[PDB]
Coordinates of C-alpha atoms and ligand atoms in Angstrom, one line a residue:
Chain A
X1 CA 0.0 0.0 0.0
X2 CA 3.0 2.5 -0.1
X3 CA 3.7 3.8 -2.9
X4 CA 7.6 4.3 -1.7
X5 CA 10.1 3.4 1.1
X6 CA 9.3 6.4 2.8
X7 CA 5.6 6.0 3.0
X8 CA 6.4 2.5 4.7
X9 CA 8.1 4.3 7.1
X10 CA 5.6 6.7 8.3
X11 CA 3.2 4.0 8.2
X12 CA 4.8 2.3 10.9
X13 CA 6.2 5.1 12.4
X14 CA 2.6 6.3 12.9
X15 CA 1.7 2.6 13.7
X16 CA 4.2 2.4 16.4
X17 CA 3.4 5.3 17.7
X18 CA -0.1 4.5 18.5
X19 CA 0.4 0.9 20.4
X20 CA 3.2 2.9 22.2
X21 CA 0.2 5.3 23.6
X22 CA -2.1 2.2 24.0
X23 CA 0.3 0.4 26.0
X24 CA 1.7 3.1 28.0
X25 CA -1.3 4.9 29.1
X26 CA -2.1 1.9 31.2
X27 CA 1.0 2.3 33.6
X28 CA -0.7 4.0 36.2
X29 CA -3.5 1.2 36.4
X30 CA -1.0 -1.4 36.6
X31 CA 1.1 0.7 39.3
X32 CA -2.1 1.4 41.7
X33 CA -1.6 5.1 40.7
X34 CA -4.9 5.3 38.7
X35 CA -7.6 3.4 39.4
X36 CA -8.6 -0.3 37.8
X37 CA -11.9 0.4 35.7
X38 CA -12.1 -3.3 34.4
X39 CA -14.5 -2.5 31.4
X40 CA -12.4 0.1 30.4
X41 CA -9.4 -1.8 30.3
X42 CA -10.8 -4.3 28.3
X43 CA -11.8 -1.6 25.4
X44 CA -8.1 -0.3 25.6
X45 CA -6.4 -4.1 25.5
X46 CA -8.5 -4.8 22.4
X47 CA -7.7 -1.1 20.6
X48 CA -3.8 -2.3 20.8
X49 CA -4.8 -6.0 19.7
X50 CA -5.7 -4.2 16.9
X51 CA -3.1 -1.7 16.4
X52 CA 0.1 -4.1 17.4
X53 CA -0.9 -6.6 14.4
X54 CA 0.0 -3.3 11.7
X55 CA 3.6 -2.4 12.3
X56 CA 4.9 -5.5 10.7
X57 CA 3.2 -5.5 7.4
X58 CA 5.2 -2.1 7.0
X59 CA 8.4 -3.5 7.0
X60 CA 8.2 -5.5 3.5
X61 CA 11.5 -6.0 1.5
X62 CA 13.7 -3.1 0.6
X63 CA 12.0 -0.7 3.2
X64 CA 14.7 0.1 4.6
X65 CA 15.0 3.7 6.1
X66 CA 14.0 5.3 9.9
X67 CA 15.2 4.3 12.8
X68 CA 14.6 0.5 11.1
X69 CA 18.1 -1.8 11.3
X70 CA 18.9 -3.4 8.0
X71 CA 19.3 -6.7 10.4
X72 CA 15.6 -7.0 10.1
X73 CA 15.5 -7.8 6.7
X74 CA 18.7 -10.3 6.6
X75 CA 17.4 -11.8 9.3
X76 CA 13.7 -12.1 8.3
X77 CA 12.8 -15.5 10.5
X78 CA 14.3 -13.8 13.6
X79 CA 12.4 -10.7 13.9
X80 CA 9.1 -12.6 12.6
X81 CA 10.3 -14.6 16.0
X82 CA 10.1 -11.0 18.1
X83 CA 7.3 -10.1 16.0
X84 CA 5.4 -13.2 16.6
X85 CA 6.5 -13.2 20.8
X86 CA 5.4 -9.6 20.9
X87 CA 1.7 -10.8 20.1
X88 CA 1.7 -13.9 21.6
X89 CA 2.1 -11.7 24.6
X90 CA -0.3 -9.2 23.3
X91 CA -2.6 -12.4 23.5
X92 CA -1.6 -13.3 27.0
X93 CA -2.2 -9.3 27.8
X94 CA -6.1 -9.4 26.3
X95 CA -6.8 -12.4 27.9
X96 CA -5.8 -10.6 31.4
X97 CA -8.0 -8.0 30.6
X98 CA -10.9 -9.9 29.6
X99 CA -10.7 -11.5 32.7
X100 CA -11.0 -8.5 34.7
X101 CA -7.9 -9.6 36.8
X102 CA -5.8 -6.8 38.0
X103 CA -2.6 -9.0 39.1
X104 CA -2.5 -11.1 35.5
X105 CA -3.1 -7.4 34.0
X106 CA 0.2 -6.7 36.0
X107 CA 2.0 -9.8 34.8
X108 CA 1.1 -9.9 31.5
X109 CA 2.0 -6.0 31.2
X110 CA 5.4 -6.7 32.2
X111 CA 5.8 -9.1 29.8
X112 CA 4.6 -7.1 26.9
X113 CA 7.0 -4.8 28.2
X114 CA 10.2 -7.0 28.1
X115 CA 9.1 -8.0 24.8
X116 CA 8.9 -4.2 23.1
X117 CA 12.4 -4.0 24.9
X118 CA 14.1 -7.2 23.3
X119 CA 13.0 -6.0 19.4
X120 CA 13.9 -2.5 20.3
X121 CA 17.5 -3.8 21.7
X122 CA 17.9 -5.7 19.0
X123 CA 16.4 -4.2 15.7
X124 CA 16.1 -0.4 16.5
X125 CA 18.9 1.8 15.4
X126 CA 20.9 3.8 18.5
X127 CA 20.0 7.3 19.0
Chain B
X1 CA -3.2 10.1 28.4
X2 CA -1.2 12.7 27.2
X3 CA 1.6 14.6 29.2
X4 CA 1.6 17.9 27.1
X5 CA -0.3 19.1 24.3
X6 CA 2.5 18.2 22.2
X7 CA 1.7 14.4 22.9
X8 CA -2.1 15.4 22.1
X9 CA -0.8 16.7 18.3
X10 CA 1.8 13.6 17.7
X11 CA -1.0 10.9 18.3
X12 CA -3.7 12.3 16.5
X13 CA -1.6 12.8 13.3
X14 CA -0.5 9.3 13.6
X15 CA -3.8 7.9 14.1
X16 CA -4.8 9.6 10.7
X17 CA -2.1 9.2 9.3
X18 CA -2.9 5.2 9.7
X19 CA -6.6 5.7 8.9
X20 CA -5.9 7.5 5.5
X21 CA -3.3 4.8 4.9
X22 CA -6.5 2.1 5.8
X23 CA -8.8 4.3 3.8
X24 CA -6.6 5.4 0.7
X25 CA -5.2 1.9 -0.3
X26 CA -8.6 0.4 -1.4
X27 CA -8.9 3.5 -4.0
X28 CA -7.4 1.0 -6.4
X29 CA -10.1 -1.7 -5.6
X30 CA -12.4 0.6 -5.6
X31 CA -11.6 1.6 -9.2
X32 CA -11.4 -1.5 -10.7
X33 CA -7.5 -1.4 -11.0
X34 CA -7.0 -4.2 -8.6
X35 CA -9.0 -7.2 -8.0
X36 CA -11.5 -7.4 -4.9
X37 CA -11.3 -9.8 -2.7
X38 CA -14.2 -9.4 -0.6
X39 CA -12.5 -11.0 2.6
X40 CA -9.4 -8.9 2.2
X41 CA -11.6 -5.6 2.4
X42 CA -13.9 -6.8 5.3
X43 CA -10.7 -7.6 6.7
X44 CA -9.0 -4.0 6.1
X45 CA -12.6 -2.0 6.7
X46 CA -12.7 -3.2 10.2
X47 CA -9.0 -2.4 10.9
X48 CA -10.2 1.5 9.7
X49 CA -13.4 1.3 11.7
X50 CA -10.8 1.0 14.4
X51 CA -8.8 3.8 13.6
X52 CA -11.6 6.0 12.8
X53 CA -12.9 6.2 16.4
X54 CA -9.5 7.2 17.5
X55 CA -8.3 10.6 16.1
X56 CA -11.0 12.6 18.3
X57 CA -10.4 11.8 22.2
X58 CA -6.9 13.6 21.1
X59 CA -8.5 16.7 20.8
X60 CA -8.9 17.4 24.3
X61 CA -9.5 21.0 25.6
X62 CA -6.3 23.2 25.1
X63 CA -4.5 20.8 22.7
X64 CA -4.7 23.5 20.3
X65 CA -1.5 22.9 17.7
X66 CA -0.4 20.9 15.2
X67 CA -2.7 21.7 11.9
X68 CA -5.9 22.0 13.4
X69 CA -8.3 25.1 13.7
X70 CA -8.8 26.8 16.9
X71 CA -12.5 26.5 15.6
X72 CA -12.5 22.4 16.7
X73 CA -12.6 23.9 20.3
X74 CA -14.9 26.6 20.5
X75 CA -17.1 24.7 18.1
X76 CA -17.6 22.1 19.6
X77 CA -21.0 20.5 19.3
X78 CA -20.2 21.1 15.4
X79 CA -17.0 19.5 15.0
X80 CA -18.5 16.5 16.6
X81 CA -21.1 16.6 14.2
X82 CA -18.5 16.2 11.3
X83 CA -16.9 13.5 13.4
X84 CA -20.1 11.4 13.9
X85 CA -21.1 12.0 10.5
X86 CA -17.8 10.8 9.1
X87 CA -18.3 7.6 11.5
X88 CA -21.5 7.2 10.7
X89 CA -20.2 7.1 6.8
X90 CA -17.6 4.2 8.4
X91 CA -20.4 2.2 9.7
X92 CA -22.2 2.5 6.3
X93 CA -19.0 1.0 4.5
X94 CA -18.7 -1.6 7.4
X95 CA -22.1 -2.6 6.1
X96 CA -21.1 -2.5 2.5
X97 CA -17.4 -4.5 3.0
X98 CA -19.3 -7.1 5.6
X99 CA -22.0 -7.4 2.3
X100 CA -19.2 -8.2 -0.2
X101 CA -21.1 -5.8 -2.3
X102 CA -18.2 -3.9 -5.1
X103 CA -21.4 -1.5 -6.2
X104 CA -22.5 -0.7 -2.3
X105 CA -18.7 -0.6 -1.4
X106 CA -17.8 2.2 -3.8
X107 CA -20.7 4.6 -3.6
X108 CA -19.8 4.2 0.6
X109 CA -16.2 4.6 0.2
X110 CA -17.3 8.0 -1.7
X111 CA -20.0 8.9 1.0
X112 CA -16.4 8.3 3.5
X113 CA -14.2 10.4 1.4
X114 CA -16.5 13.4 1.2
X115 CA -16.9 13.2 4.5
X116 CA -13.4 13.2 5.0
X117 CA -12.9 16.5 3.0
X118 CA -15.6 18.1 4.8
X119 CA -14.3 18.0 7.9
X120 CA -10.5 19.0 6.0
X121 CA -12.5 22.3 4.6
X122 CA -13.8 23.3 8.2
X123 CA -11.4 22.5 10.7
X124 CA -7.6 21.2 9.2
X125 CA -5.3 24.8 9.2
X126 CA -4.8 25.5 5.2
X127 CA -1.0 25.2 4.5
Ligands
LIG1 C1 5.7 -2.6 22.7 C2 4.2 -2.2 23.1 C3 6.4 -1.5 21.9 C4 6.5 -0.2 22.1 C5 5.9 0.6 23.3 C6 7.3 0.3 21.1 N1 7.7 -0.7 20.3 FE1 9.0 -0.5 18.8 N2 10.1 -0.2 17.1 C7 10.6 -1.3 16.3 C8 11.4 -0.8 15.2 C9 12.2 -1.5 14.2 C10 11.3 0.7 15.3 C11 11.8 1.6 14.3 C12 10.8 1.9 13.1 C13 11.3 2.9 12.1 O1 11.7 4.0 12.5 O2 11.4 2.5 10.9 C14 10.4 1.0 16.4 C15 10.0 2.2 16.8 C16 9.2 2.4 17.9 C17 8.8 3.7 18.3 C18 9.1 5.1 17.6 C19 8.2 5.3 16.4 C20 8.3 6.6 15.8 O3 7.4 7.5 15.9 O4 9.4 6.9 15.1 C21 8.1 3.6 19.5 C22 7.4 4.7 20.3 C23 8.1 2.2 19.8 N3 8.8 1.5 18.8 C24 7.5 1.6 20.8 C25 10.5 -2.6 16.6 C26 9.7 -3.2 17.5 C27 9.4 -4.6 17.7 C28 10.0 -5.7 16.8 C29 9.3 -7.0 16.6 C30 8.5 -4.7 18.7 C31 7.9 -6.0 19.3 C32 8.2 -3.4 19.2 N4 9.0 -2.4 18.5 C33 7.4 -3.1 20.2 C34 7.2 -1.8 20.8
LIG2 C1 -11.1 10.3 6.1 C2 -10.8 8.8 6.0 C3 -9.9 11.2 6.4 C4 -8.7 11.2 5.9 C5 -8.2 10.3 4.7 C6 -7.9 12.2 6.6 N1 -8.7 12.8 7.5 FE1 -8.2 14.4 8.6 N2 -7.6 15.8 9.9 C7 -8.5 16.6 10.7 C8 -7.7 17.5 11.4 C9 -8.3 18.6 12.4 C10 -6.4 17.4 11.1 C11 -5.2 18.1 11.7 C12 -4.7 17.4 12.9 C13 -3.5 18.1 13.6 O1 -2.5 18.3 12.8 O2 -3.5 18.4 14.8 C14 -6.3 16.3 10.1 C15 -5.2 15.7 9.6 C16 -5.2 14.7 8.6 C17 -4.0 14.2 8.1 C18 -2.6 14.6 8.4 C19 -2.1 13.9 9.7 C20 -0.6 14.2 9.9 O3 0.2 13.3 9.8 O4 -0.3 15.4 10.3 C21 -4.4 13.2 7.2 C22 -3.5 12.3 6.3 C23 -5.8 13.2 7.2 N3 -6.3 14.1 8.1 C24 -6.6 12.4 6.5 C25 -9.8 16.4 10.8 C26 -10.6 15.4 10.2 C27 -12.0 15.1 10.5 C28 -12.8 16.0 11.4 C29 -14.1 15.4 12.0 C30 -12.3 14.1 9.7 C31 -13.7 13.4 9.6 C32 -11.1 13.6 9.0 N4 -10.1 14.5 9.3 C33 -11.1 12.6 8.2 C34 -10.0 12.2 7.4

């Protein structure tokens, strides 16, 4: 759907930039800070179900460009693997919030968490 | 969610950023210029009914910047017309794409688009 590399790039750019808010804005929940409105953490989960299923489709061959390293492209069965552990524990994270249940919310946040850090580590160029 | 207005701006253009990328990609299917697979678009319409509920919670009071009109704020009972209309027009190609109907598709995808520009004439800052 991009008519060239650089379109790709503010596609997921944009992309990213969404499940980043998605995900984020439930910290305080999970810390106790905010309060633990179960209906409307539900609604949220499923918005970045959605949302964390579009960066990938962004990255198709040649793409290269943004803070992208070209290691995702050499190495296209690894990051599928962090791509495909990322939303495995997206799953893990909606099924929390379907649930209701505050402490898996907590667990399963964490592990999104450590899975956003191990692609970035490994597949997002230094600053 | 947002810590400064700033934040406000940056997820509001990515979110339509990602809903014109949603929306603007089916203009060749829509044409005739590529095939349509009625799955494919049920599949996509439903990611951009997503997206298109998403834009407006980031215009929150004072989150004036970015290109958008001061006249979102003070009129606000009337922007919010042009956003429900425009979803409205989303629901109506939900209908369409869920049909597998090419003939209802495109004449909602117009319906969409103009309501799109509508709201672009009103309330998006000229450049
Ligand atoms: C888990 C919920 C997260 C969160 C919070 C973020 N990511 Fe990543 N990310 C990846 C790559 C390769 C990039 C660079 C893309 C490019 O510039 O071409 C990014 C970028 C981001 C951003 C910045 C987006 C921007 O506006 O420029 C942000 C805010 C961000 N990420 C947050 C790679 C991955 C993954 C590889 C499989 C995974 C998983 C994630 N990111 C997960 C997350
Ligand atoms: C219907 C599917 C569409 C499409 C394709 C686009 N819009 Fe709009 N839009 C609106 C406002 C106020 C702005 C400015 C926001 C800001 O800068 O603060 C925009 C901006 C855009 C963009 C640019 C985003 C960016 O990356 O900077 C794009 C690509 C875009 N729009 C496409 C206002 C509205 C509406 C008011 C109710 C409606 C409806 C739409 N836009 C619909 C669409």
């Amino acid at each position: 759907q991009f008519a060239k590399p650089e379109d790709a790039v503010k596609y997921r750019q944009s992309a990213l930039t969404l499940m980043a808010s998605h995900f984020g804005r439930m910290t305080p929940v999970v810390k106790g800070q905010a309060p633990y409105d179960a209906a409307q953490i539900k609604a949220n989960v499923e918005v970045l179900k959605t949302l964390s299923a579009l960066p990938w489709a962004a990255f198709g061959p040649g793409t290269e460009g943004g803070d992208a390293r070209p290691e995702i492209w050499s190495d296209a069965a690894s990051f599928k693997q962090k791509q495909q552990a990322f939303q495995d524990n997206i799953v893990k994270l909606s099924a929390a919030a379907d649930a209701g249940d505050l402490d898996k919310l907590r667990a399963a946040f964490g592990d999104v968490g450590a899975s956003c850090k191990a692609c970035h580590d490994a597949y997002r160029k230094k600053k």
